[PDB]
């Protein structure tokens, strides 16, 4: 059903002699041109919505001192992550999608895949680290401990280490970056069993270390937090404000957990199917179904984690309305 070569895999059979290198000729045989136009349109959407919302976060952080607290660093980190998702991934894929194929060759594939994977992993591990920080600060699990600047910096560096420990192996021999789906964007190889780079062990290490571990850490930390808040509000039913707080905190934890699942579950499940029923017939459009949900997390992660944060909100309505409110 496919068509392989030295540094790619076109999910389209060369029985008709039409398949060409995704680095060299347009792939209008695995998708009409208008579908490449819609690919470019969606990239345009993700840039027009994703760049303002994420850059503005860093901006208002520069304007408002009450935002430059350590328990906010990871949020800033998230914004930077999304910008790596925007300029390392979304814009490149816009340009290449407008040509019908990946014009920047194998090296450009390694770059666009390295920065797209990097940004996405920084975002994910920032979500995990944030959950850990809120568990520690709110649940008070260690005797005589308060959260300082050095702890926050440590957390950000941990996100960077977990990201590099997930984006660098394909550049040096563990798995590899190849054009995915409609061959216009580059990603981690999990649809060929390429033994020379040991794709199977890397895909297992992804699913276990960079999916199961974060999932468990988030669910644990936020379950513990909702327990703590529920329990305190139970011991304080005379305080209506504590009741409000219990409600809002529960609703937010549900929103964040469900958003995490919507974001990373399709990628894990579809990729795991392409690595459990591997080798079959996979429409490029079928291949771009989890990447949709994951890539849109550069837009709704700032909406959930920043725009729904009363501090950041306030400072943004202040900045955009250039003075008051």
């Amino acid at each position: 059903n496919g068509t392989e070569g030295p540094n790619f895999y076109v999910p389209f059979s060369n029985k008709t002699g039409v398949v060409r290198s995704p680095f060299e000729a347009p792939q209008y045989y695995l998708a009409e041109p208008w579908q490449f136009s819609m690919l470019a349109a969606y990239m345009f959407l993700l840039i027009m919505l994703g760049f303002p919302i994420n850059f503005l976060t860093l901006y208002v952080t520069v304007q408002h001192k009450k935002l430059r607290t350590p328990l906010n660093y990871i949020l800033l980190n998230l914004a930077v992550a999304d910008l790596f998702m925007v300029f390392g991934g979304f814009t490149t894929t816009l340009y290449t999608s407008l040509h019908g194929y990946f014009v920047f060759g194998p090296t450009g594939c390694n770059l666009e895949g390295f920065f797209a994977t990097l940004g996405g992993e920084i975002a994910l591990w920032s979500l995990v680290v944030l959950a850990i920080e809120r568990y520690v600060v709110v649940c008070k699990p260690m005797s005589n401990f308060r959260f300082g600047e050095n702890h926050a910096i440590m957390g950000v560096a941990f996100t960077w280490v977990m990201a590099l420990a997930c984006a660098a192996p394909p550049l040096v021999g563990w798995s590899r970056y190849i054009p995915e789906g409609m061959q216009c964007s580059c990603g981690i190889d999990y649809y060929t069993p390429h033994e020379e780079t040991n794709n199977e062990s890397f895909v297992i290490y992804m699913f276990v270390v960079h999916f199961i571990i974060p999932l468990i850490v988030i669910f644990f930390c936020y379950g513990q937090l909702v327990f703590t808040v529920k329990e305190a509000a139970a011991q304080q039913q005379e305080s209506a404000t504590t009741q409000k707080a219990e409600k809002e905190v529960t609703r937010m934890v549900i929103i964040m957990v469900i958003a995490f699942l919507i974001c990373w579950l399709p990628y894990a499940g579809v990729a795991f199917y392409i690595f459990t029923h591997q080798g079959s017939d996979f429409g490029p459009i079928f291949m771009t179904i989890p990447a949709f949900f994951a890539k849109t997390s550069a837009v709704y992660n700032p909406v959930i984690y920043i725009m729904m944060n009363k501090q950041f909100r306030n400072c943004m309505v202040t900045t955009l309305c250039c003075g008051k409110n």
Partner: peptide, 11 residues
């Protein structure tokens, strides 16, 4: 924990 909730931006 209302103070902690505001610190972490959850309330």
């Amino acid at each position: 924990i209302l103070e902690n909730l505001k610190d972490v931006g959850l309330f």
